[PDB]
Input
Amino acid sequence: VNTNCNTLDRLLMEAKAVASQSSTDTEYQFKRPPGSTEMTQDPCGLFQ
Amino acid sequence: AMPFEIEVLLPGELSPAETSALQKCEGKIITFSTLRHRASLVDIALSSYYINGAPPDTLSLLEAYRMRFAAVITRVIPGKLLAHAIGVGTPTPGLFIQNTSPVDLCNGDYICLLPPVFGSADSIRLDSVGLEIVFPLTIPQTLMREIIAKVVARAVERTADVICYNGRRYELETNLQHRDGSDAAIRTLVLNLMFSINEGCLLLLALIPTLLRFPIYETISSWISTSSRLGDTLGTRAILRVCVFDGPSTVHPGDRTAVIQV
Amino acid sequence: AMPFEIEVLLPGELSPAETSALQKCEGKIITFSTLRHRASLVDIALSSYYINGAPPDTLSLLEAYRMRFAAVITRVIPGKLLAHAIGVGTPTPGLFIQNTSPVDLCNGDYICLLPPVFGSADSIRLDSVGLEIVFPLTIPQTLMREIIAKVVARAVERTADVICYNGRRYELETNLQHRDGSDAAIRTLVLNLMFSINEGCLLLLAPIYETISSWISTSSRLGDTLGTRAILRVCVFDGPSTVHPGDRTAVIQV
Amino acid sequence: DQLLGVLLEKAPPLSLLSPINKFQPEGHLNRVARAALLSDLKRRVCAD
Amino acid sequence: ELAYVRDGVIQFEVQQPMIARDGPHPVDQPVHNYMVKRIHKRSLSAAF
Amino acid sequence: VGDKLVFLEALERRVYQATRVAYPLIGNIDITFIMPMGVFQANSMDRY
Amino acid sequence: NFTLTQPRAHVDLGVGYTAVCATAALRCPLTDMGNTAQNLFFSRGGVPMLHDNVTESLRRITASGGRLNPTEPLPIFGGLRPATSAGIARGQASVC
Amino acid sequence: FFKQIRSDDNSLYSAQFDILLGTYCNTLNFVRFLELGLSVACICTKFP
Output
């Protein structure tokens, strides 16, 4: 993020409304369709 | 009967160097996957044609300009963007267009679409939001086949010649060695053209060699499959017609003119 | 200005659960060898597709689904069937079809009508006057350009069955009678194969513009002449994206 | 007697109606949600 | 007249107290903050 | 609650019932797991 | 068909954070946490092997040990989709 | 110079504004030492 050098604690502003990565409806874990609307949480993709 | 009016909510924070560049492009054609009344500036940008997470070639755009509904930009205010659909049957009154193609459209022609199959697109880089928008060229319907075939023909030779309209010739070379990228930005199309005419000039000899383990009734089906599945993507048709009343007859590039619906 | 509506005076000698059998058939396609305002029920039946006293088949209906004026049945009132033609030159402001295919229909696709080939027809039968109506399966222009491949890959196998779509297998069959009709498809194939090769193909084997400029003309005609041209395009405005087999959808002319 | 006999041949089980009552909103569950619900249906039968 | 607004804004202004102190230390002064934020546009829709 | 007066809402019976819309307080969460396969404890003091 | 739209807008009136969330309970897991390997033969990547038959044999030997793998006759253009199974039992299959 | 070549061109009817929708400030709290409780521990005395 370009404002990485701008914000001090940008942890709180990136922990809320991530978009879903995988498709929630197929038999396998496909990639999300180009226009899905679901939203999830990623406590692990936050702290790596 | 009302014109199918679309609105694209231009976000804030667009630096005036970009709002100053969105004005001058009023009357250019854009595509939508599905057609709504409220769109988004990302539903127009280049990131819509991503197939394998990467920008599209000059082949994927040939299907995109046959599967995504088009819409002509009608008017722009500094707040938002307004455009009218064209393909469906709607009475849209004004419906002008600005010729964005290196050619002069004579009066009473028919217009088809074409991705920038030569050179760089005079696009718009909205850096304050992180996306790029590309606009298809508006070439006449008679110059379609010549251009789409000559661009492949001048590439197969480099892998191994001028267009002219309204009495004015246009050197396609543009005086520079475009041999880097353009032979790979068109790679997917020329490579699919090889193995569909290379199969053609052999199976005819295979059937009856006296005209002048390798299933026959599988390849005879894999040839009519491909040669016909491609027989529409490259053979596109007209969508608009350049009609003028009490105005000029020829429209130089960059200048706008009125059109009707096919 | 006004769509070409066609009224056809239904015969009054029909059972109540036979006029109720035509209201389960709104949004389906018919055809017309001649195009007039006033018509009769005989004209859109299978009794009319008969080639010479003889029934048709796959390679003979596909020589009729591109020689007649297709029309959409809009709304049948008791005693009169209303319909709107397609490839005429007038607009149909509100149009719609019923998906008779066995697959899904996405948005924006190109619809091509095909005679029943999947070994399972949906025919409407009438014993009252002794007729039978056939409704062609609307297939997208991708699967339609492979079924036409397979029909000729079998028809030439005669004169010497599964196809994947959206991740599923689909099985079909045919009844290739009328040796005339299975020979007529050979000459056009061999002609287009002849008229696609030129003197410039030597570099492709080891002018080049002339060759491909001649070849695109063959490619555009081949699939259109061995099958059906695209006649309708599905464009949902507010409805859901996919059209499951049996639903009705918002279509536009092509 | 008939009223009992008619109410009895009409009442589905409780362990089969309470879970599907918890998944009523948009009761046309996609292929995945019914498969994830059946795993709880099999478990909530043996427990009571 | 919401459909005519380019972008509406609201403004804040907050003061912060301070504490007098000994040495050795740069003496504190009053600070004044000024903030602006923009409004986002949404919509609803229905049909019959 | 605590030292405050708050409402206590549950909007899935007045609104969101009998319509085909999912209640937006039923969310998702994604959690990533890790397992070591084929590790040999390359020591002797550790294999007892 | 009549359609009714209505534009709206909003903005936050705090200096700090006004709303807060907390995931409290746990409903059913939506994906089975089981073994389903990934197949890299879906990717149409870069440098290929030299003898095409060795590639064709590698792919089949790989496919003889999984259920997520491309349909055997590879298409000349497309996404190499896998075959949809006749049924599903525990939930969406998470890939390893 | 901005001549309207033909007649009554567009962009002569725009009426697009942007409104300052409010302004908010805060009032500091002024504390006194003797009102505290910490001042039991001391005997303050003024001495010029």
